[PDB]
Design a protein around this nucleic acid. Structure first.
Ligand SMILES: *P([O])(=O)(O[C][C]1O[C](N2[C]=C([C])C(=O)[N]C2=O)[C][C]1[O])OP([O])(=O)OP([O])([O])=O
Ligand SMILES: [Mg+2]
Ligand SMILES: [Mg+2]
Length: 342
DNA sequence: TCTAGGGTCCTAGGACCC
DNA sequence: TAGGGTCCTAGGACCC
């Protein structure tokens, strides 16, 4: 009953698009991200910038101290969305079992596939080659019997490469696999796991499921299963977006409600436009607001509400501003909508 | 260095129902 | 008849 799962992942996706579209950026350190003045972070960087330590999620002021010649780009999301549509059409030439996880990556289930003599290895190579031939961007891939191993595999021969894990190879692969490599095990969980002596899947194999369930709940079960190589999650091609949000961080903290209302007045048209692309009548389940203060604490209040409404969002922002706030600067204002269930 | 914006999923207490 | 299920809501880890 061994499945064949491919995970395909574009290399340096936004930066790779900006280099294709402007080859002057091919050989200098570049990153997509907000300026230091706009208090931004790096969305991604190309390999010349990564050499300096530039990474996604790094504050832009840190990126520039590492890499003073970093060229900073604002990002062209329609160009990225166009590349995404194109690689997803390429995936559809091989299977309809496609679960996109973001613009630039997807799981493919090729168990029942007829192409390339049923070789998942060869299908993944053909997909990478087609992507390069038709988009002039490179992709990496991972092939494994389950989702999470395929996703780990696609990182191991990046860029422009792939890696295959057979069922025979899974135990040796797991034995020394750090837990932080498992998708869903982040910094906070890895630090709690490390503090109790659990660093690798090998360690977690030496653990009692009951203990893990008590200490971590349902996450304890996922940890126990992943460390065994167990991941029965099916490739699901039917997922749908559940929310849409629009938020902005100010270049300077705001301290007056008039400044906050001004911001919302700019955010609301953007939220209406994006909602209307997917729900023309603007009918929704909930709407709400988000404030983030200068001490980085963040609050949201949302409520049942039938149709996107600018004044109610203003009124709700005003309550949050008056109430849970307390004289701090505000760095971010956001609007949010929960979509009607399908 | 000084910390984004797009999202998904889980948890947990109280309201509400039976 | 003392408790079980199910929304509502806020927060936060985590993902790209
Ligand atoms: P990935 O595959 O992790 O992200 C794809 C693109 O999403 C954007 N993005 C990513 C991260 C991790 C983030 O924190 N913020 C983002 O905005 C930019 C990404 O390009 O990232 P990648 O393709 O760039 O890097 P590699 O080559 O390692 O896959
Ligand atoms: Mg990528
Ligand atoms: Mg990706």
């Amino acid at each position: 009953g061994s499945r064949k799962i491919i995970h395909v992942d574009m290399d340096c996706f936004f930066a790779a698009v900006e280099m294709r579209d402007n080859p002057a950026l091919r050989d200098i350190p570049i990153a997509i991200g907000g300026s230091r003045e706009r208090r931004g972070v790096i969305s991604t960087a190309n390999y010349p910038a990564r050499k300096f330590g530039v990474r996604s999620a790094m504050p832009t002021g840190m990126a520039l101290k590492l890499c003073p010649h970093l060229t900073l780009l604002p990002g062209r999301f329609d160009a990225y969305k166009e590349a995404s549509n194109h690689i997803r059409e390429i995936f559809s030439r091989y299977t309809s079992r496609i679960e996109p996880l973001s613009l630039d990556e997807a799981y493919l289930d090729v168990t029942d596939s007829v192409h390339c003599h049923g070789s998942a290895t060869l299908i993944a190579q053909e997909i990478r080659q087609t992507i390069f031939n038709e988009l002039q961007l490179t992709a990496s891939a991972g092939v494994a019997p389950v989702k999470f191993l395929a996703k780990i595999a696609s990182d191991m021969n990046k860029p422009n490469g792939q890696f295959v894990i057979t069922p025979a190879e899974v135990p040796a692969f797991l034995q020394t696999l750090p837990l932080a490599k498992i998708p869903g095990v982040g910094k906070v969980s890895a630090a709690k796991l490390e503090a109790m002596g659990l660093r690798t899947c090998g360690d977690v194999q030496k653990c009692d499921l009951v203990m893990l369930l008590k200490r971590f709940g349902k996450f304890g079960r996922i940890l126990w299963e992943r460390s065994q190589g167990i991941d029965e999650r099916d490739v699901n091609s039917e997922r749908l977006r559940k929310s849409v949000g629009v938020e902005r961080t100010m270049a300077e903290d705001i301290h007056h409600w008039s400044e906050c209302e001004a911001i919302i007045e700019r955010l609301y048209p953007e939220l209406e436009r994006r909602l209307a692309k997917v729900k023309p009548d603007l009918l929704i389940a909930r709407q709400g607001v988000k404030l983030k203060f200068d001490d980085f604490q963040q609050t949201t209040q949302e409520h049942v509400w039938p149709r996107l409404n600018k004044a109610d969002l203003i009124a709700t922002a005003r309550k949050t501003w008056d109430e849970r706030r307390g004289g701090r600067g505000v760095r971010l204002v956001g609007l949010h909508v929960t979509l009607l269930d399908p």
